[PDB]
Design a protein around this ligand. Structure first.
Ligand SMILES: CO[C@@H](C(=O)N1Cc2[nH]nc(NC(=O)c3ccc(N4CCN(C)CC4)cc3)c2C1)c1ccccc1
Ligand SMILES: [Mg+2]
Length: 270
């Protein structure tokens, strides 16, 4: 299989942290002199399946704004997934820590255009991500941003995907249909994308500030939504709101979303 490679090609450099099933390393693909990220699996989990699912999905997608699979080591432990190295780490900490004169209003629009471009691509190929959030996007030089963490991504056969009994999702990014019935779709990615914009507009605040996790769903039912963040352009808030429409099919498509950010990003560039 074309993605498989020899464990011995890679040397570990440093632990990176941030892992779910195992440590995530900064390593070096020696023959190419290339720094890479290496996601490893703790031999002692039965989460082998999910770990391998992430890898399977990354073989099937490719886009400038989706973190890129480089190869795998999966003929025996410890399992490795090898991925392009993004030097600045997660988008959430990147927003909290940045210099806002640099990461300014035009950069915010640039970040959203990047993500929506990726998500438009996924939409087109009938994929869903299911974990879109600042914490799962990755940052490179000059505010390059890529969607990452594809463990939960799926190719749908229809327009809907239903998670299995017992699955739990992060309350404040998850569409109501998904919280209530475990139904996911391109449109539930659109909801999370909306929450992701709010994260960008606030430079990484936690959403629904001070609101008890237990009461968020019920609030959504009664049409409570987050208010416009300070400094957030009116058109951007309209889109955020469109993303949070109760009915999935009232939410804009990512092509429409990308189109609107593309426009706004260009006008701001004069
Ligand atoms: C859990 O999987 C990883 C994953 O797949 N990955 C694939 C992939 N590619 N590049 C990565 N970079 C880092 O992990 C990283 C972390 C901290 C880092 N610094 C810390 C703070 N400083 C400001 C700069 C140096 C610099 C780079 C990752 C993680 C993941 C982690 C976070 C978000 C999305 C995915
Ligand atoms: Mg994650």
């Amino acid at each position: 299989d074309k993605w498989e490679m020899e464990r011995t090609d890679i040397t570990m450099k440093h632990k990176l942290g941030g892992g779910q099933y195992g440590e995530v390393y900064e390593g070096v693909w020696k023959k190419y002199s290339l720094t890479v990220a290496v996601k490893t699996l703790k031999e002692d989990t039965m989460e082998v399946e999910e770990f391998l699912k992430e890898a399977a999905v990354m073989k099937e997608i490719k886009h400038p704004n989706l973190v890129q699979l480089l190869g795998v080591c999966t003929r025996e432990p410890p399992f490795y997934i090898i991925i392009e190295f993004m030097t600045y780490g997660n988008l959430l900490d990147y927003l909290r820590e940045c210099n806002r004169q640099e990461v300014n209003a035009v950069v915010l629009l640039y970040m959203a255009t990047q993500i929506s471009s990726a998500m438009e691509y996924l939409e087109k190929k009938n994929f869903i991500h299911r974990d879109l959030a600042a914490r799962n996007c990755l940052v490179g030089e000059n505010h390059l941003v890529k969607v990452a963490d594809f463990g939960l991504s799926r190719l749908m056969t229809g327009d809907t995907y239903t998670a299995h009994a017992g699955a739990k999702f992060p309350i404040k990014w998850t569409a109501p249909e998904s919280l209530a019935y475990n139904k996911f779709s391109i449109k539930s990615d659109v909801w999370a994308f909306g929450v992701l914009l709010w994260e960008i507009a606030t430079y990484g605040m936690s959403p629904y500030p001070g609101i008890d996790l237990s009461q968020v769903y019920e609030l959504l039912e009664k049409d409570y939504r987050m208010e416009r963040p300070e400094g957030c352009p009116e058109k951007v808030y309209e889109l955020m709101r469109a993303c949070w429409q109760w009915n999935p099919s009232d939410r804009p498509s990512f092509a429409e979303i990308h189109q609107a950010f593309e426009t706004m990003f260009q006008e701001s560039s004069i």
